[PDB]
Amino acid sequence: DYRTFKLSLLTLAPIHIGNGEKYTSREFIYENKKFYFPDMGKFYNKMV
């Protein structure tokens, strides 16, 4: 009594779904032609 469909989604453009949170500029590094988002806990552990 159940019908199952498969929906294949091909993005034709950028698609953003947020969670309400935002990276601040004190949280990512722009270098080597890339944006690096480190883990803040790991960064702090290496910085202590």
Added chain:
RNA sequence: ACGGAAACCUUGAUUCUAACGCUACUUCUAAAUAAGCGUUA
């Protein structure tokens, strides 16, 4: 020097045996972390 004297209403006995506060029941129902970019330059 009294129809009086002497004489335990006393001994032994478990208010005990058996028995599920149990049977059935979805913390469930819909819901894009999303909308607006004006005016000046």
